[model samples]
Target chain A: NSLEIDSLARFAVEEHNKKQNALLEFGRVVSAQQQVVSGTLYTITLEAKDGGQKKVYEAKVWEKPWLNFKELQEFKHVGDAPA
Target chain B: SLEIDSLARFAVEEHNKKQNALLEFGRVVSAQQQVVSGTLYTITLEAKDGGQKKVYEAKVWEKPWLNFKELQEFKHVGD
Candidate 1:
């Protein structure tokens, strides 16, 4: 079956209005897998805007093994200041 | 006396090496099969102390697993 990739462009636009410091803006669902003897596969395109328009970076978010939002909290505040 | 001390040091070093290798192997194998059916995973990015990093959490068959593949993925993000 084809992946049900949601168009997050609207959500990002709406969120940006409320959260000016938004860092992640999703582009498109690159791929999605419902069944795999191993794990669910979800690939997505991302546009990273570091609170600026010109400094945008295109990236990908590949979610597998089901890493949830809470789990991602661990890596959020690590490392040095971004200059 | 000194011979015994040297032997003891060598044993400690050998044990450490073996322990490290075993841990690494276990991680590799776990990584290979951690993704199973009925699993849920998430990817997140956060800023702490003004630094940004990516984090992953894998839930296989309702079990949660964590891995740091963000560092690796971002290393090539610029390219």
Candidate 2:
């Protein structure tokens, strides 16, 4: 009565790799939910930099191995950018 | 106006609050299984200030079933 979490991790990593820039680093899984459309939906945090401005972004991963930027955003205020 | 920049700032602040709380509490070492119902995720977390480990489980889901058109800011960044 258990499902392997490894598969979930693998899927998340593969989806992220599909991108061309490869600037983001996996932070953590914010949330995971079952999708009626087909696969699980994952809301995760990714770290990256924008012209020297380092930030974190929230991205969603669909079970289709698809990426959704619908809610993508900076993880901190520009003024609060790490020093 | 709800500018994307402000929205992003707010989202970042909120996300950091939660993440800080989690880090202050513990670190997730492995999130590797679902308990029986298949809807819940069972994860293992290591205490931040100590060596104790614990199992934390929870379910993630969406509401209203098919509303996938909600406007999302900062939709994509890396790539």
Candidate 3:
């Protein structure tokens, strides 16, 4: 666990919520794939709460953590998750 | 029309609950289905928010075999 990837994943949800005006509460990141290209591409499979239910959402974020700037590129419901 | 209408209603209902807004289901304006791992229904429709008519798009993925349908996306649109 790089541990940092988890932070990136959390940021994904926060940034997505801001842009989409969604009220998804962050659960946790189940999987994360980070790579370098046009800033750091963080493709994370994260769990977010949709009301009483927990669902899996795929999120892609471009971040320059060093610069304290981040942006949410993609975030969408992939499937339902464990209750 | 039935399937698309059903999905449109579901999308409306889900969005209503998600945003805690009273959105009345109007009708489906456009729809398309994707044969992904599941049947991903992309539905665009008209709905009423506070008695104001508006357009919206929603993506609902269904696994009929498992009797499952998940709301993938919901957004208000210009079209």
Residues B1-79 of candidate 2 have per-residue lDDT tens digits of 2333333344444554756522111111111111111232322211111223222222232233342122112123221
lDDT winner: 3
lDDT for each residue of candidate 2 in A6-59, tens digit (9 for 90 to 100): 344333333434543333333334333443334343344434444555544553
Q: What is the lDDT of residue A38 in candidate 2?
A: 42
Residues A5-79, candidate 3: write the lDDT tens digits: 444444444444576776545444443332223335445554545567766655444455578655454555677
When 1 and 3 are scored with lDDT, the better candidate is 3
Ranking of models by DockQ:
2, 1, 3
TM-score of B-chain for each predicted structure, in order = 0.25, 0.26, 0.50
Question: Who is ahead in DockQ, 2 or 3?
Answer: 2
Error at A25, model 3, angstroms: 25
lDDT on C-alpha atoms for all candidate structures: 0.25, 0.33, 0.49
Q: How well does candidate 1 score on lDDT at residue A78?
A: 16
Show the colliding residue pairs in model 2: A69-B75, A72-B74, A75-B12
Model 2 DockQ vs. reference: 0.06
Question: What is the DockQ for all candidates, taken in turn?
Answer: 0.06, 0.06, 0.02
Candidate 1 per-residue lDDT, tens place, A1-83, comes to: 22211322223223443445645433333322222234322221112222322121111122333444111111111122233
